[PDB]
Design a protein around this ligand. Structure first.
Ligand SMILES: Nc1ncnc2c1ncn2[C@@H]1O[C@H](COP(=O)(O)OP(=O)(O)CP(=O)(O)O)[C@@H](O)[C@H]1O
Ligand SMILES: Nc1ncnc2c1ncn2[C@@H]1O[C@H](COP(=O)(O)OP(=O)(O)CP(=O)(O)O)[C@@H](O)[C@H]1O
Ligand SMILES: Cc1cn([C@H]2C[C@H](O)[C@@H](COP(=O)(O)O)O2)c(=O)[nH]c1=O
Ligand SMILES: Cc1cn([C@H]2C[C@H](O)[C@@H](COP(=O)(O)O)O2)c(=O)[nH]c1=O
Ligand SMILES: [Cl-]
Ligand SMILES: [Mg+2]
Ligand SMILES: [Mg+2]
Ligand SMILES: [Mg+2]
Ligand SMILES: [Mg+2]
Lengths: 194, 195
């Protein structure tokens, strides 16, 4: 049971994933929650680079994938082996939507890099938190280098294209308050998980 | 003009690349010299990760490629534009020989990633410093995780096969004395550059 949250910055992924985490632990699941990029010692070094340094788009791509690879080997595959429910705050669709649809790198190439880093590990469900860009940006404080309107409109569109084309992606209206969104996540999750 | 040095650990790449830097400077070229992994601030942090951490082979490949991508975009392409001769202490054949022949990852995939990271930039000449593994390892004072006989015998063989398959690779016998090996380098280079 691998549950991924996806969506643009300010869709509320981190808030929603921590809520789901604690809710499942309550219900007696064994649960893990990891962020991408990050989630391992090495991945957190890479996250810092990715967030702080001026990178070209090809370097950035390779470092998002390196973070993922480490997280898959070190944490995700061993957790799934142990019947831990694993919740991911971003996963493979983020790389396609940001570095592909956003930055213009080839989506088909990114897919193959994704499969390489993941060893083909796929979520049981992906919750795409969809929200208009203006709404999302208004939730944020400081803007990171990805959190700009022109760019995020392309990213939002790319996620919605992926939801049509990729498997097991459910589109969640994330424009509501925290609990209405959380209830929509639980309704979508009841489709794969008690 | 892009010149790459390749070969197993202890073949003398770093020693020879710096000799060549000094030689070309004395001839009035503008010259750059970079190591892989490393060569940029970002790259040098990746290098540290690569040497110090236990990494799975896939993460390792991707970090080697990320270091290369950074070096290509930040340093190598701007330098080639300025007519600097660029000398590399390791480049794309290292990744094929180490991660492909040594670690067993798919060579075609590695080549695909190499092309991505380099934007198709290729050396004018690659000097493969060939040497028996036992000779090479005896030159080294401390061993990193790659500097293992079992592993390097696979890698040495992979380099020698690449020197047949790839373009513009010249095999240099690197078991000799430093100056001798340097002379053989210069003779090879004279094919592609005024020495
Ligand atoms: N439904 C909702 N309505 C209003 N504000 C919300 C909200 N869900 C979360 N927020 C607030 O929006 C801000 C961003 O939330 P969060 O950190 O969950 O988003 P995110 O993870 O999508 C940003 P990123 O993609 O850059 O990491 C936080 O202040 C959070 O409290
Ligand atoms: N031709 C030669 N004969 C004997 N010793 C040599 C030599 N060339 C270099 N050495 C010595 O061997 C050691 C390793 O040299 P060097 O650092 O150039 O190799 P290298 O760059 O192939 C190792 P690595 O691949 O791990 O970076 C140094 O002590 C160096 O002085
Ligand atoms: C995982 C991932 C994140 N990102 C961006 C989105 C965020 O703005 C930033 C940090 O994301 P995070 O805080 O959700 O981990 O990285 C990519 O550009 N590509 C990726 O593959
Ligand atoms: C560039 C490169 C180096 N390496 C290894 C060889 C060395 O043992 C180690 C450090 O290289 P360096 O000191 O020659 O720069 O990295 C690879 O495995 N793959 C690569 O693509
Ligand atoms: Cl994918
Ligand atoms: Mg977040
Ligand atoms: Mg919008
Ligand atoms: Mg060296
Ligand atoms: Mg010059």
């Amino acid at each position: 049971m691998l549950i991924a949250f996806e969506g643009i910055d300010g869709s509320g992924k981190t808030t929603q994933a921590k809520k789901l985490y604690e809710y499942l632990k309550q219900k007696g699941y064994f649960v893990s929650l990891y962020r991408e990029p990050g989630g391992t010692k090495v991945g957190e070094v890479l996250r810092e680079i990715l967030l702080t340094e001026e990178l070209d788009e090809r370097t950035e791509l390779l470092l998002f994938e390196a973070s993922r690879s480490k997280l898959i080997e070190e944490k995700i595959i061993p957790d799934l082996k142990r019947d831990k429910v694993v919740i991911l705050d971003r996963f493979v669709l983020s790389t396609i939507a940001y570095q592909g649809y956003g930055k213009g790198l080839d989506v088909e190439f990114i897919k193959n890099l994704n499969e390489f880093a993941t060893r083909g590990v796929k979520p049981d469900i992906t919750l795409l938190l969809d929200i208009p860009v203006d709404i999302a940006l208004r939730r944020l404080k400081e803007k990171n280098r990805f959190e700009n309107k022109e760019f995020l409109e392309k990213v939002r569109k790319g996620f919605l294209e992926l939801a049509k084309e990729e498997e097991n992606v459910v589109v969640i209206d994330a424009s509501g308050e925290e609990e209405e969104v959380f209830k929509e996540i639980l309704r979508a999750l009841s489709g794969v998980l008690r």
